[PDB]
Amino acid sequence: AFKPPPRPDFGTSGRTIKLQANFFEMDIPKIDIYHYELDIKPEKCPRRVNREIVEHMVQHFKTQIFGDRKPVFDGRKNLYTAMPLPIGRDKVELEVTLPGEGKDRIFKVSIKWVSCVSLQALHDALSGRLPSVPFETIQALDVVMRHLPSMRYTPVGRSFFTASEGCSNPLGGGREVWFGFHQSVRPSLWKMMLNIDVSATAFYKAQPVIEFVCEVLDFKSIEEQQKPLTDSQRVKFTKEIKGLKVEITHCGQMKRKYRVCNVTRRPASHQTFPTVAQYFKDRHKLVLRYPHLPCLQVGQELPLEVCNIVAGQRCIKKLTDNQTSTMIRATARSAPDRQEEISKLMRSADFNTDPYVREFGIMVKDEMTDVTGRVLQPPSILYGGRNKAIATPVQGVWDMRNKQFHTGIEIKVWAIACFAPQRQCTEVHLKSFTEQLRKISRDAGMPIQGQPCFCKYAQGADSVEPMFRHLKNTYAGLQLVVVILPGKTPVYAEVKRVGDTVLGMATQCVQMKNVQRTTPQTLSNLCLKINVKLGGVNNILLPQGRPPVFQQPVIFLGADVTHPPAGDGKKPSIAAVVGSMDAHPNRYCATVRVQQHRQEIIQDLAAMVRELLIQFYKSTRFKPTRIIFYRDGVSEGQFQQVLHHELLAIREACIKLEKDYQPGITFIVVQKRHHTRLFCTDKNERVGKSGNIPAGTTVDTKITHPTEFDFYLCSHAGIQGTSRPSHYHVLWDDNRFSSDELQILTYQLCHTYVRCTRSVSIPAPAYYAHLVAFRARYHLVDDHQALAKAVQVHQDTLRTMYFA
RNA sequence: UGGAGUGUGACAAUGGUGU
RNA sequence: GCCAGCCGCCUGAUGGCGGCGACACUCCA
Ligand SMILES: [Ba+2]
Ligand SMILES: [Ba+2]
């Protein structure tokens, strides 16, 4: 096994900044708690009614089994007590009746002593005496902290939602925003923390289906529809209730929870039922109030006044762009807004009154955790030309105005293939676009010497490969093909398949709307991409400002795996790995593979890293003495696996390059998907309307691991909403990095992303790896080895950053 | 397909089981 | 334990081919 190195030091670089984090300190006793296992018969029940069963079991066998003890329940098979039960260590069988009268099911439950979970061991791990934190104890504490919320609120994953209080938040036809919160127990130095963040989703309004139709079909009242429903109205009302659940209410106090299927075009009166309207006057004595609305077909092969909408449905449906817009009005709050909302939620949830967390002697603080962060100094960015301009990122941003590329490509043979309609993308557009692009190019030190040698329209994907062939054969020295497109078109994937994998020709696509009208910003970022695609070097980190790691040859790797949505039989997951090819580091080379459907481990990593090392040795004439590996998208539970496989893969790739070649490996996992938020304590340190922490804000205390080498770094400037600081976890480090050195290196690498002049949220290696997987997915658009070949890039473009 | 960011979306950590 | 969801297009759900590895919003010289 490979265990991650401990935190080497605590880091002191940068200017300090006071922060608050959405972690609330917990007070955890040092006594042991007791874990029992449950099995409820039958097992054809939702998780909610298993919780009701267990609650009635605790209330019924109070004097026999439990007593004053108030246990907690996972929902499936895990019960926990703060005191041992009198049942001993052997299984016990109990009979639990379920109340309701209209339906009374009998359940056979079995309680069995499993284990004695030690909170003292948890405290030992929180101090660092024990190196690794017990996951099972963390799970027990979690179950304890979400026992009551799982029953008083609506559970959705690790979040809980409710219907506000009074004034709802109307969304659209039959929906409304529910506000909720994610909750999770996390370990940290000396103390457990309760991590709380706010969230929202969409639920169906618990209204009678009449109101449903009124809001779906825009009726001031139901008396509006004094005629039968029209063609488009039936299908409209169908697409909104095709699978929802309704409650038949023509019954007494007794209710129903029958699901829904389709909608008829027969208004009850005119539907032969071997009519329906007739059926409701004789079977039950209920004259229909609206015998002109349609019926709700059920299941697979009823009036709208008899049905209601079953409260609590989560609306798994997709939302209208206007419901998405109102959702973002409600959810993407400024950082102070979200801070205040989390604090208010924690002040109202009253965890220090939950009888179950108090049964276990736990207390939760009401205030966010104070964290002393550090704003790291941003690197200076060296540009080119007679000026040799230096750019200083200011709040994570700089501009290329009055600056020229470090090394700018002279473009002197290029073509234009316009797959947009000539009627819409006229020749005046092409002329003025060329003029403006050339002006911006010359301004940036990437001059385009003369008009395009070739400039023609075309249509259809079938035209792509022939044309390019012609272009490659009839125009010598062809550097670039600009491909104007009319929007999302199958022509794009074909352009990339031909230019990247078949012929090895560099292409730059551009949307019609950016040729008809140009702006300096769009043309400039496009020039960035064009330059690096022709081998340019837009800029480099100021050489002297870099950490000491650059005093010897070093290669930086970025790796990512993209998966398809669940359900696809094969749709192989795409693994991409990129590697730096110079000391700057600016140029990166890519490798990609298809592998088992939804597998996170990069199976063929050894071969890919071998390719990258070979290219590095060829380009620099030296072998790296250090390998810095940035690995994206790995969960805690996958650490052991991925580390064991991929560390060994890298070592193999090394020794396959040379017998005794053992460079030091730094394996770092990059994670953006978490629920950690950081807020400025001083209103003066807030940046740009959103009110976020400054770019470069770093945290490696109070919410990080108690013993291991992890840290939050927010390297980007937040625009709208609350910034998501990237989290970094060092799974392996032969090179004995200091906290400061590694944090600074990560930050500086975040300024080497060629596609834009701003510090981005993750290091350029990782971002490039994502881009490479994206392009690979595009290359598969038209057998396993067939796919593996289709995703193989031509040898001439492999030399370039075609994925920019 | 100029580009970055953050909201929703991952049904492994979830959810169904009288016309 | 058995089961898996949503949206399109065609035959007009008795099937078949595609998406949800995205959409949305904010913001740049
Ligand atoms: Ba089950
Ligand atoms: Ba990933």
mmCIF file of N, CA, C and O (backbone and C1' of nucleotides) and ligand atoms in Angstrom, chain A residues 43-47 50 76, chain B residues 15-17, chain C residues 1-3, ligand 1:
data_model
loop_
_atom_site.group_PDB
_atom_site.id
_atom_site.type_symbol
_atom_site.label_atom_id
_atom_site.label_comp_id
_atom_site.label_asym_id
_atom_site.label_seq_id
_atom_site.Cartn_x
_atom_site.Cartn_y
_atom_site.Cartn_z
ATOM 1 N N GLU A 43 -38.670 -6.210 2.637
ATOM 2 C CA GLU A 43 -37.688 -5.222 2.209
ATOM 3 C C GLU A 43 -38.100 -4.607 0.876
ATOM 4 O O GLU A 43 -37.277 -4.390 -0.014
ATOM 5 N N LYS A 44 -39.394 -4.317 0.735
ATOM 6 C CA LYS A 44 -39.941 -3.699 -0.469
ATOM 7 C C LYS A 44 -40.492 -2.318 -0.131
ATOM 8 O O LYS A 44 -41.607 -1.969 -0.537
ATOM 9 N N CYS A 45 -39.721 -1.535 0.620
ATOM 10 C CA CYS A 45 -40.167 -0.287 1.219
ATOM 11 C C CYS A 45 -39.234 0.860 0.858
ATOM 12 O O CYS A 45 -38.036 0.645 0.646
ATOM 13 N N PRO A 46 -39.745 2.091 0.796
ATOM 14 C CA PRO A 46 -38.855 3.250 0.680
ATOM 15 C C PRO A 46 -38.113 3.488 1.987
ATOM 16 O O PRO A 46 -38.475 2.964 3.044
ATOM 17 N N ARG A 47 -37.059 4.304 1.906
ATOM 18 C CA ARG A 47 -36.232 4.545 3.086
ATOM 19 C C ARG A 47 -37.013 5.269 4.178
ATOM 20 O O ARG A 47 -36.715 5.100 5.364
ATOM 21 N N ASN A 50 -39.053 2.760 6.424
ATOM 22 C CA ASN A 50 -38.152 2.030 7.312
ATOM 23 C C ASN A 50 -37.811 2.872 8.535
ATOM 24 O O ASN A 50 -37.709 2.344 9.652
ATOM 25 N N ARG A 76 -31.330 2.162 6.389
ATOM 26 C CA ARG A 76 -31.311 0.823 5.806
ATOM 27 C C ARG A 76 -30.988 -0.256 6.834
ATOM 28 O O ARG A 76 -31.855 -1.081 7.129
ATOM 29 P P G B 15 -33.355 8.182 -1.254
ATOM 30 O "O5'" G B 15 -34.427 7.668 -2.315
ATOM 31 C "C5'" G B 15 -35.206 8.584 -3.072
ATOM 32 C "C4'" G B 15 -35.659 7.975 -4.376
ATOM 33 C "C3'" G B 15 -36.607 6.788 -4.268
ATOM 34 O "O3'" G B 15 -37.962 7.174 -4.090
ATOM 35 C "C1'" G B 15 -34.856 6.262 -5.765
ATOM 36 P P G B 16 -38.956 6.275 -3.201
ATOM 37 O "O5'" G B 16 -39.711 5.351 -4.260
ATOM 38 C "C5'" G B 16 -40.815 5.844 -5.009
ATOM 39 C "C4'" G B 16 -41.283 4.845 -6.040
ATOM 40 C "C3'" G B 16 -41.815 3.524 -5.500
ATOM 41 O "O3'" G B 16 -43.176 3.601 -5.111
ATOM 42 C "C1'" G B 16 -40.264 3.102 -7.237
ATOM 43 P P U B 17 -43.670 2.974 -3.716
ATOM 44 O "O5'" U B 17 -43.704 1.403 -3.983
ATOM 45 C "C5'" U B 17 -44.551 0.843 -4.977
ATOM 46 C "C4'" U B 17 -44.114 -0.552 -5.343
ATOM 47 C "C3'" U B 17 -44.063 -1.552 -4.197
ATOM 48 O "O3'" U B 17 -45.326 -2.120 -3.899
ATOM 49 C "C1'" U B 17 -42.043 -1.657 -5.409
ATOM 50 O "O5'" G C 1 -30.746 -8.309 -3.860
ATOM 51 C "C5'" G C 1 -31.147 -9.569 -3.291
ATOM 52 C "C4'" G C 1 -32.581 -9.852 -3.651
ATOM 53 C "C3'" G C 1 -33.042 -9.169 -4.928
ATOM 54 O "O3'" G C 1 -32.707 -9.972 -6.094
ATOM 55 C "C1'" G C 1 -34.550 -8.675 -3.132
ATOM 56 P P C C 2 -32.003 -9.307 -7.443
ATOM 57 O "O5'" C C 2 -33.258 -8.777 -8.268
ATOM 58 C "C5'" C C 2 -34.234 -9.694 -8.794
ATOM 59 C "C4'" C C 2 -35.519 -8.968 -9.105
ATOM 60 C "C3'" C C 2 -35.384 -7.760 -10.014
ATOM 61 O "O3'" C C 2 -35.185 -8.037 -11.412
ATOM 62 C "C1'" C C 2 -36.752 -7.196 -8.175
ATOM 63 P P C C 3 -34.071 -7.199 -12.278
ATOM 64 O "O5'" C C 3 -34.696 -5.739 -12.398
ATOM 65 C "C5'" C C 3 -35.941 -5.533 -13.049
ATOM 66 C "C4'" C C 3 -36.551 -4.202 -12.690
ATOM 67 C "C3'" C C 3 -35.767 -2.969 -13.107
ATOM 68 O "O3'" C C 3 -35.937 -2.643 -14.475
ATOM 69 C "C1'" C C 3 -36.472 -2.727 -10.868
HETATM 70 BA BA BA D 1 -34.452 -1.051 -1.469
#
